[PDB]
Symmetry: C3
Subunit: 99 residues, 3 copies
């Protein structure tokens, strides 16, 4: 019911290890509702996370709270990425091919 942001990011399979997720938050690469955050902050439903994956930026809305890391098909249910983020993500994807 109460889970840390680093934990949650890990449970959602955004980062491979719990350490990587906690390093990523701490290095300011993850926002929570548009701000820098602690990795021990407890996640809320309807919160906005903005995170960096490889070269992508993703903004996702927390749908659900788990402290368990599960198979890929089963982790997706915790979050939806905004339409904003998707189009924006693929537009920069494009550009790199054209470069």
């Amino acid at each position: 019911e109460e889970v840390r942001l680093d934990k949650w990011l890990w449970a959602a399979r955004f980062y491979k290890t719990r350490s990587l997720a906690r390093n990523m938050v701490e290095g300011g690469k993850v926002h929570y509702n548009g701000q820098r955050a602690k990795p021990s902050k407890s996640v809320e439903i309807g919160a906005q996370i903005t995170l960096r994956q490889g070269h992508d930026e993703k903004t996702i809305i927390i749908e659900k709270i788990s402290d368990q890391r599960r198979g890929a098909p089963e982790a997706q249910q915790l979050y939806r990425e905004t339409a904003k983020s998707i189009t924006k993500r693929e537009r920069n994807a494009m550009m790199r091919q054209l470069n």
Copy 2:
């Protein structure tokens, strides 16, 4: 718990002001479950809104009912845009200047 459509649209930050939202609903530029509606209609969870935000059309599903207009990061949780609406917005968009 009971919120007007014009109000909801304002809270969701689709229109900047409440008054413009009611003018938009009155002018048929907003659909509620594929039909024209009154701006005083009480919103439901899981309802379909179709609206024009500029030169685009957006179809979104109400995720959450609030009567509070809040910051941009916090308004996104009220709705998700359909896969249909997204692909279609992007279809017509990159259509406009290659023209």
Copy 3:
């Protein structure tokens, strides 16, 4: 509410008849959490369904459980498609007759 994968797929308007839906699961054309399934498997919220529609594949998450096939505006609320599935569809799309 206890609903078949069968009925659910039909209620969400993925396949036009209840029989076609039962046939698609039975022919292995529908995955449930990355596996082949019985069309009698009871559907759960947050489950991952991967299905063949046209020449496309779609990955969606169960948002809601209904056993009622309702109007198109009203069915969309049972499910969301992942961003991944969306980009994958349009990638294989654009790539199609651009050929």
